[PDB]
């Protein structure tokens, strides 16, 4: 039993809800919130900009130190950093950005990072401003993640389309 509320159950392990991931994280304070990161951990817009704003820029400050020490992430890769006031940990995961010409096949690799964590609050990787098809991102999530994932879909109209089209 966990404290996630109001989710539709898609499979044994994947749940979905129309919600603002920032507000969800503040309410649940999950062990792991997933950020839709880029390789530079520059949290400007989309989920990343919103999460970082909610931390009063502490996420960005921590991220800049991480990059100065370790260099950029790989597309498809991840790192674990603090969750600040939102969660215990933030798993920064880099899905491919179609608006940069990155290989959509890397989306499966990106979702594989979720399997290192028993329970996660997450967005659909490569969706939104990353330019991939969200219906595809959900399919890859369901077919790749084996741990318990609670998906927050900000757009109510998109959420209804994802539910009604889910196979
Ligand atoms: O796939 C990630 C989606 C993509 C979008 C598609 N249409 C509108 S945003 N983004 C978000 N998802 C959940 N919470 C969020 N908070 C802030 C952004 C955000
Ligand atoms: Cl987005």
Swiss-Prot record:
Domain (Macro): residue spans on this chain: 1-167
Documented activity regulation: Inhibited in vitro by GRL-0617.
Catalytic activity line of the entry: Thiol-dependent hydrolysis of ester, thioester, amide, peptide and isopeptide bonds formed by the C-terminal Gly of ubiquitin (a 76-residue protein attached to proteins as an intracellular targeting signal)
Topology term for the membrane: Multi-pass membrane protein
Domain of life, source organism: Viruses
Annotated compartments: Host endoplasmic reticulum membrane
SUBUNIT field: May form homohexamers. Interacts with N protein.
Function: Responsible for the cleavages located at the N-terminus of the replicase polyprotein. Participates together with nsp4 in the assembly of virally-induced cytoplasmic double-membrane vesicles necessary for viral replication. Antagonizes innate immune induction of type I interferon by blocking the phosphorylation, dimerization and subsequent nuclear translocation of host IRF3. Also prevents host NF-kappa-B signaling. In addition, PL-PRO possesses a deubiquitinating/deISGylating activity and processes both 'Lys-48'- and 'Lys-63'-linked polyubiquitin chains from cellular substrates.
Protein's recorded name: Papain-like protease nsp3
Organism encoding this protein: Severe acute respiratory syndrome coronavirus 2
């Amino acid at each position: 039993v966990n404290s996630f509320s109001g989710y539709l159950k898609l499979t044994d392990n994947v749940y979905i809800k129309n919600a603002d991931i920032v507000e969800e994280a503040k309410k649940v304070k999950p062990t792991v919130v997933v950020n839709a990161a880029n390789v530079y951990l520059k949290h400007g817009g989309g989920v990343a900009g919103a999460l970082n704003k909610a931390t009063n820029n502490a996420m960005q400050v921590e991220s800049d130190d991480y990059i100065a020490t370790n260099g950029p992430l790989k597309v498809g890769g991840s790192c674990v950093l603090s969750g600040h006031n939102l969660a215990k940990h933030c798993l920064h995961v880099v899905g491919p950005n179609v608006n940069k010409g990155e290989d959509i096949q890397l989306l499966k690799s990106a979702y594989e990072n979720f399997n290192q964590h028993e329970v996660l609050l997450a967005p659909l990787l490569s969706a939104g401003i990353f330019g991939a098809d969200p219906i595809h991102s959900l399919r890859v999530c369901v077919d790749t993640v084996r741990t318990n994932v609670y998906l927050a879909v900000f757009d109510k109209n998109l959420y209804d389309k994802l539910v009604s089209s889910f196979l």
